[PDB]
Amino acid sequence: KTRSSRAGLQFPVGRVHRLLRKGNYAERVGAGAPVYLAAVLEYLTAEILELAGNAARDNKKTRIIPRHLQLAVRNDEELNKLLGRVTIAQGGVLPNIQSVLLPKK
Amino acid sequence: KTRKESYAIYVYKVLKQVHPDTGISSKAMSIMNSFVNDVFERIAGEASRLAHYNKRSTITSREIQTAVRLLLPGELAKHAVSEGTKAVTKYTSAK
């Protein structure tokens, strides 16, 4: 029935279409535009959540928390490049000590 | 009370595909809702310029596809374009 079920998507094609219209991004929005964009947003959502789920498992947690989103983003090459100008609340930083600082003896 | 829409249910639906036993905190959910809103605005804002530069009134799936290839890096663009093309293919094949 609904366009998301036609596209095979979880993300809301109809709402993406509404936002494309009301954002004034163009005088008109083609019928394939929200289907394609919803599929891209769903993919990127799945890509982060896949990695964050693994980061959660590595911390024995069952619930993803911002720590795991920061770990998922910053450990992944393309996602770190996509989110290079993004700061994540409560994310922290990657564990990283410059090798010259370690107590070589 | 005034009603505020968000992507929360859809991120959760996708989460239960990738990691059925995993959950997500409301702070992490707020971040994921922010992420989707940001990436939406980037692609739509680029596709708008791609339409304008071509003097064309419509944002089509073709404007989205180029905007994705411009914005997303590396393999992430290649997979995203694959998912987008498959979705539009299935959608236009619907009755």
């Binding site: 993919y43 890509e47 | 393999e75 992430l76 997979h79 998912e83």
Partner: peptide, 4 residues
């Protein structure tokens, strides 16, 4: 690889 990557998802989906």
């Amino acid at each position: 690889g990557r998802s989906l």
